[PDB]
C-alpha cells in the first residue's frame, strides 16, 4: 500500500497551531505506516501524509501535506515523507510548472526514465541542479517551465524525451 | 481504481486512452474541486474528521432520500463524497458513525497554488 504514496526522501513536515495534534507510533516498517494511513484506521482525522522516522523507527501521521497552508518542508536524513495521492492535485493549470503528481508515462504509453539515472538517455536534469523542482523517481515534470507542459525521458532508446498527457483542470 | 459495477463506454480506464469523462484510473479523474464541487467525481470517502463514509445506497446507519436513482448523473456510487445539490459546503457524505449523520469532506480547491 506504500506504493500509493508519493515518496520524498530525507524530508519532514512542520506545522504549528492549536487544534490538531500529530499521531505517532513506533513500528518496524514504513509499510505499517502506509497501511494504517490508507485504511485511516484509528486516526482522529483524515490522513493526508505520514513520515517514517527511519532512526527511531517511528511513524507520524499528519492531517496535512506539503501543499497545506502554513506547512513547511524541512530536510532530515532520518526522515521520509509519504503524501497521499488523493490530495496532490492530479491535473495542471496552464504550462504545469508546479505539477507535482505521480504520473510517470508519456502520451505514447512509454514509461519514464528516472531523473537521477542516465540510461538509456544521458541528460543534465539532475535533482541537485534543480532544487525546488521535485525531480524524483520518474515522475513527469516541467523543470524549466516550458510550453508543452510536463515531460520526461522515455525508457525507449528510440525516443529521447516526450511530453506526458496530463489533463487541464478546466 | 474507481470501480463502477456493470458498466462500459462506447491506459486510463479498462483499455482506452480516455474514460467515461468498469475500472477507472484515479490519475485521470480530477481530484480537486472548482467552487462548490457539484462536478466532483473523485474517490475520497472519509470526512473531515476521519470518519469513513456510509454508502449512498444504504439506509443504515442513516436513513435518507439521496438515492442514486433520484440523482442519476450525480454519480452517487459507493461511499464517495459528493455534492448532488451543488450546495455551499462542498462534497459531503452520510457517515458510518451512528452519532454523526453527515459531514463535509476535506477536498482542496483546484485554484489553490
From Swiss-Prot, chain A:
Residues 1-86 form the PAN domain. Residues 91-169 form the Kringle domain. Disulfide bonds join 33-59, 37-47, 91-169, 112-152, 140-164. It comes from the Eukaryota. This is Hepatocyte growth factor alpha chain. It comes from Homo sapiens. The gene is HGF.
Amino acid at each position: 500500500t506504500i506504493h500509493e504514496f508519493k515518496k520524498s526522501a530525507k524530508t519532514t513536515l512542520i506545522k504549528i497551531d492549536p487544534a490538531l495534534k500529530i499521531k505517532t507510533k513506533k513500528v518496524n516498517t514504513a509499510d505499517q505506516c502506509a497501511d494504517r494511513c490508507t485504511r485511516n484506521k484509528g486516526l482522529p482525522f483524515t490522513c493526508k501524509a505520514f513520515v517514517f522516522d527511519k532512526a527511531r523507527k517511528q511513524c507520524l501521521w499528519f492531517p496535512f501535506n506539503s501543499m497545506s497552508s502554513g506547512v513547511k518542508k524541512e530536510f532530515g536524513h532520518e526522515f521520509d515523507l509519504y503524501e497521499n495521492k488523493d490530495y496532490i492535485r492530479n491535473c495542471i493549470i496552464g504550462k504545469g510548472r508546479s505539477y507535482k503528481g505521480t504520473v510517470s508515462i508519456t502520451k505514447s504509453g512509454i514509461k519514464c526514465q528516472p531523473w537521477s539515472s542516465m540510461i538509456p538517455h544521458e541528460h543534465s536534469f539532475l535533482p541537485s541542479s534543480y532544487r525546488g523542482k521535485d525531480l524524483q523517481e520518474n515522475y513527469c515534470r516541467n523543470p524549466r517551465g516550458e510550453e508543452g507542459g510536463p515531460w520526461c525521458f522515455t525508457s525507449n532508446p528510440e525516443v529521447r524525451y516526450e511530453v506526458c498527457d496530463i489533463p487541464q483542470c478546466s
